[PDB]
C-alpha cells in the first residue's frame, strides 16, 4: 500500500523519526509519540521510498538522516509504502490463559506444540508489532506481557520478519 505523506516540523527542529538502511531500502526504525510522524501514521517497518521527490534507494541510514536534517522548509514530503512483509495471526487463549509461544525483546522465538499459536501458524523470529490493534513497538517485554494477559480470550497479533 503506497501513499503520499506531508509532515509539518516541530517546535524544536525535528519530526520524531529514525530510519534504517536495509538491503538498499529505507525503513522506519522508530517513531516517537505525538510527533509529526505519529499524526501522519508512520510505523516501525514502513518503507520510505522517496523524501521530497528524491529516491531513497541505496542510501545509508546516516544519509537519510542528513537529508531529513538539512530539510529546506517546514514541510517534508514523503512517499511511503505501508509496512510490507507484515502478517496477522488470530489466536485463542486456552483454559490456562495461554496462546502458546515464547518471546524475548519483542521477538517470537519459539512456538509451543499443540497450542493456539501452533494451529494458527505463528512464525518465529518475527517482531510483535500490534496486539489487538494496539501498538507495542518500543515497549518492554513486561508491558507487552501485561497487554497480553489483560486481553480477552481473542489475541490478534500483527508480526513481521526480524
Amino acid at each position: 500500500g503506497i501513499r503520499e505523506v506531508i509532515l509539518c516540523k516541530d517546535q524544536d527542529g525535528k519530526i520524531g523519526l529514525r530510519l534504517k538502511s536495509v538491503d538498499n531500502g529505507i525503513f522506519v526504525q522508530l517513531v516517537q509519540a505525538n510527533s509529526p510522524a505519529s499524526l501522519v501514521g508512520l510505523r516501525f517497518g514502513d518503507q520510505v521510498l522517496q523524501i521530497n521527490g528524491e529516491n531513497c534507494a541505496g542510501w545509508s541510514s546516516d544519509k537519510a538522516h542528513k537529508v531529513l536534517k538539512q530539510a529546506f522548509g517546514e514541510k517534508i514530503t514523503m512517499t511511503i509504502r505501508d509496512r510490507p512483509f507484515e502478517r496477522t495471526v488470530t489466536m485463542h487463549k486456552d483454559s490456562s490463559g495461554h496462546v502458546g509461544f515464547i518471546f524475548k525483546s519483542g521477538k517470537i522465538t519459539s512456538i509451543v506444540k499443540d497450542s493456539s499459536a501452533a494451529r494458527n501458524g505463528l512464525l518465529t523470529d518475527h517482531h510483535i508489532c500490534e496486539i489487538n490493534g494496539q501498538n507495542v513497538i518500543g515497549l518492554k517485554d513486561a508491558q507487552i506481557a501485561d497487554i497480553l494477559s489483560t486481553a480477552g480470550t481473542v489475541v490478534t497479533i500483527t508480526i513481521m520478519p526480524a
Binding site: 495461554h98 509461544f101 515464547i102 518471546f103 524475548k104 522465538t109 499459536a117 517485554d141 513486561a142 497480553l148
Partner: peptide, 8 residues
C-alpha cells in the same frame, strides 16, 4: 543469568 524470556 536469567533468560528474561516471556510466555504468552
Amino acid at each position: 543469568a536469567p533468560t528474561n524470556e516471556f510466555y504468552a
